[PDB]
Design a protein around this nucleic acid. Structure first.
Length: 74
DNA sequence: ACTGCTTTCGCATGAACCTCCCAACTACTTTTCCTCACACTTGTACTCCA
């Protein structure tokens, strides 16, 4: 319900839904072949809030823009 | 009586204040997000004691 929805999205989600598309396609890429392509600054997991939108940034509140960049690693 | 004691007055034109706020960079909060390992049971393992 839109009344107090509290949607559960994190940067751990956008890798997890990117891992499941790899096993339905039956790919040899894994979470060792994801954490080696994100912590080596290859696909934009880290620092995503700050450089990606460039026009949609400013009206987003402070705790929401905190979650969308690559804050920690999982 | 007479002084001091006033009072108008001027060659013609050109022109020649102060407190509070918005500063600047510090620091110490806000605005709700995500991420989970913790309490008592219960079921299942391999002992038991009569």
């Amino acid at each position: 319900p839109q009344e107090e929805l509290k949607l559960q999205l994190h940067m751990t989600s956008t890798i997890s839904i990117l891992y499941l598309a790899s096993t339905h396609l039956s790919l040899p890429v894994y979470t060792c072949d994801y954490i080696k392509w994100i912590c080596t600054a290859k696909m934009p997991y880290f620092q995503a809030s700050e450089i990606l939108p460039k026009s949609w940034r400013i009206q987003l509140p402070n705790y929401y823009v905190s979650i969308l960049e690559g804050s920690i690693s999982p």
